[PDB]
């Protein structure tokens, strides 16, 4: 059970980030499972984003799902986090996991960290 | 959002013990309550779910328990790989329905 | 005499018809035991309303058949043989004669989404009732009483389906809560199904 992400580690900040992330067998036959994302700048706390289901529903969060988009390959391949408006505030790492009711992030993943290049 | 103790610490090996609080109007609560270790350049991992649950593969000094408006974990076997940051996570109701709180420092 | 019939796809199915539309899934010619059962989950009821569960391994079925609803929280009393209410007038009935009986236990850990689950549906009202055991996926316009209107929506006109927002923080009383309805029929014909002997 490995979860792997990739992306740029230098972004402009007029640059929309694209971030891929690909996870290798789960159980896809199931309900009320999927994937989202959690990032965290350098202290003070986490944040929940977003998190995507195996029926396509799109659940963003409020005050910023403008900013926010989401490709879902529907092969199993990857899911691609898309977002819009790059803010130097934002600067933090951005983590998958497996998200279920039970439990709220089964597995994570070593993470990848990205800062502003202006 | 969520409150937690900034800082906590006690002597090795044993008498050592945190917890987790918040608005009881907020938060309806009553059930999925979760820990998680944190480690610097190491994936975050799952320690307790429904409270007080244990999942397999977890060491047995781990443990916890809640009571009316504040939720805690018991940790017991303080050894020179326990100094591990504890992130208390729920389900919220208004705004951002996931909270992760301010956690703690060891 | 064969295999076990898959109660594994009526029990673990990964998704469950809504509430307005019910699907059936006949089971026959099979040998089945009711004991894997009691390895699921902790029931919140399992009452039984012909039979008692102990002795129901050493019987013989003309026929059997196994719904999936998603109700609401603690509104499951409502499904009995006799019980009306809003879910028991314009949606799933049961008769006055039933046997068989309800298996039903908690699901919020499948069936639930943050933001509430909007894919279930429900039908609030009708233009009369209906006898057990019937459908109605028909989707029209529903006036009050006098005014005419059709496809545009405004005063006393309005969809008749709304959608549930089940929410993970509802708690008891307002939780999935998944149930199948089985059904029996005692030796009236030959028997399609039985149990070990």
């Given at each position: 059970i490995t979860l792997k992400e990739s992306g740029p580690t230098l972004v402009k900040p007029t640059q929309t980030l694209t971030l891929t992330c690909a996870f290798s067998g789960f159980s896809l036959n199931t309900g009320g499972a999927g994937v989202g994302w959690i990032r965290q700048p350098p202290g003070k706390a986490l944040e929940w984003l977003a998190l995507i289901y195996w029926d396509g529903d799109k659940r963003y969060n409020p005050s910023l799902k403008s900013r926010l988009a989401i490709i879902m390959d529907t092969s199993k391949n990857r899911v691609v986090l898309t977002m819009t408006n790059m803010d130097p505030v934002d600067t933090a790492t951005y983590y998958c996991a497996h998200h279920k009711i039970e439990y709220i992030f089964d597995y994570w993943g070593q993470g990848t960290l990205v800062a502003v290049s202006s | 959002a969520l409150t937690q103790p900034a800082s906590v610490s006690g002597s090795p090996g044993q008498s050592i013990t945190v917890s987790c609080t918040g608005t009881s109007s907020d938060l309806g609560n009553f059930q999925y309550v979760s820990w998680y270790q944190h480690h610097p350049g190491k994936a975050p991992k799952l320690l307790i779910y429904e409270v007080s649950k244990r999942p397999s593969g977890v060491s047995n000094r781990f443990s916890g328990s809640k009571s009316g408006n504040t939720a805690s974990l018991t940790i017991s076997g303080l050894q020179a790989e326990d100094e591990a940051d504890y992130y208390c996570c729920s389900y919220t109701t208004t705004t951002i329905p996931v909270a992760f709180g301010g956690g703690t420092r060891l | 005499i064969t295999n076990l019939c898959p109660f594994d796809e009526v029990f673990n199915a990964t998704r469950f018809a809504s509430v307005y539309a019910w699907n059936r899934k006949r089971i026959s010619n099979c040998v089945a035991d009711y004991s894997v059962l009691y390895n699921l989950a902790p029931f919140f009821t399992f009452k039984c309303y012909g039979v008692s569960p102990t002795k129901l391994n050493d019987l013989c079925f003309t026929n059997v058949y196994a719904d999936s609803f998603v109700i609401r929280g603690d509104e499951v009393r409502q499904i009995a043989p006799g019980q009306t209410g809003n879910i028991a007038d314009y949606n799933y009935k049961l008769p006055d004669d039933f046997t068989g009986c309800v298996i039903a236990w908690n699901s919020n850990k499948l069936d639930s989404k943050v933001?509430?689950?909007?894919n279930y549906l429900y039908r609030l009202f009708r233009k009369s009732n209906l006898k057990p055991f019937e459908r109605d996926i028909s989707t029209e316009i529903y006036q009050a009483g006098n005014k005419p209107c059709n496809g545009v929506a405004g005063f006393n006109c309005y969809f008749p389906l709304r959608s549930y927002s089940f929410r993970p923080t509802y708690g008891v009383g307002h939780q999935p809560y998944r149930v199948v309805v089985l059904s029996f029929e005692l030796l009236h014909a030959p028997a399609t199904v039985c149990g070990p002997k």
């Amino acid at each position: 059970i490995t979860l792997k992400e990739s992306g740029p580690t230098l972004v402009k900040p007029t640059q929309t980030l694209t971030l891929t992330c690909a996870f290798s067998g789960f159980s896809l036959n199931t309900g009320g499972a999927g994937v989202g994302w959690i990032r965290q700048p350098p202290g003070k706390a986490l944040e929940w984003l977003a998190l995507i289901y195996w029926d396509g529903d799109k659940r963003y969060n409020p005050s910023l799902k403008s900013r926010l988009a989401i490709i879902m390959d529907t092969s199993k391949n990857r899911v691609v986090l898309t977002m819009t408006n790059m803010d130097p505030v934002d600067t933090a790492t951005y983590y998958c996991a497996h998200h279920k009711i039970e439990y709220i992030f089964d597995y994570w993943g070593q993470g990848t960290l990205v800062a502003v290049s202006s | 959002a969520l409150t937690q103790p900034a800082s906590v610490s006690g002597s090795p090996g044993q008498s050592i013990t945190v917890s987790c609080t918040g608005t009881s109007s907020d938060l309806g609560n009553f059930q999925y309550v979760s820990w998680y270790q944190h480690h610097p350049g190491k994936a975050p991992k799952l320690l307790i779910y429904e409270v007080s649950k244990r999942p397999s593969g977890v060491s047995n000094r781990f443990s916890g328990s809640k009571s009316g408006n504040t939720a805690s974990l018991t940790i017991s076997g303080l050894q020179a790989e326990d100094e591990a940051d504890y992130y208390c996570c729920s389900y919220t109701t208004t705004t951002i329905p996931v909270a992760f709180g301010g956690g703690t420092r060891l | 005499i064969t295999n076990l019939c898959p109660f594994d796809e009526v029990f673990n199915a990964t998704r469950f018809a809504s509430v307005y539309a019910w699907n059936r899934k006949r089971i026959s010619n099979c040998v089945a035991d009711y004991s894997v059962l009691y390895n699921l989950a902790p029931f919140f009821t399992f009452k039984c309303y012909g039979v008692s569960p102990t002795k129901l391994n050493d019987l013989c079925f003309t026929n059997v058949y196994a719904d999936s609803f998603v109700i609401r929280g603690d509104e499951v009393r409502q499904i009995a043989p006799g019980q009306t209410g809003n879910i028991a007038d314009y949606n799933y009935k049961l008769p006055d004669d039933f046997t068989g009986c309800v298996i039903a236990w908690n699901s919020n850990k499948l069936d639930s989404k943050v933001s509430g689950n909007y894919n279930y549906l429900y039908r609030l009202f009708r233009k009369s009732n209906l006898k057990p055991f019937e459908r109605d996926i028909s989707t029209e316009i529903y006036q009050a009483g006098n005014k005419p209107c059709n496809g545009v929506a405004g005063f006393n006109c309005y969809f008749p389906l709304r959608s549930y927002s089940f929410r993970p923080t509802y708690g008891v009383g307002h939780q999935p809560y998944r149930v199948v309805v089985l059904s029996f029929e005692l030796l009236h014909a030959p028997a399609t199904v039985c149990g070990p002997k």
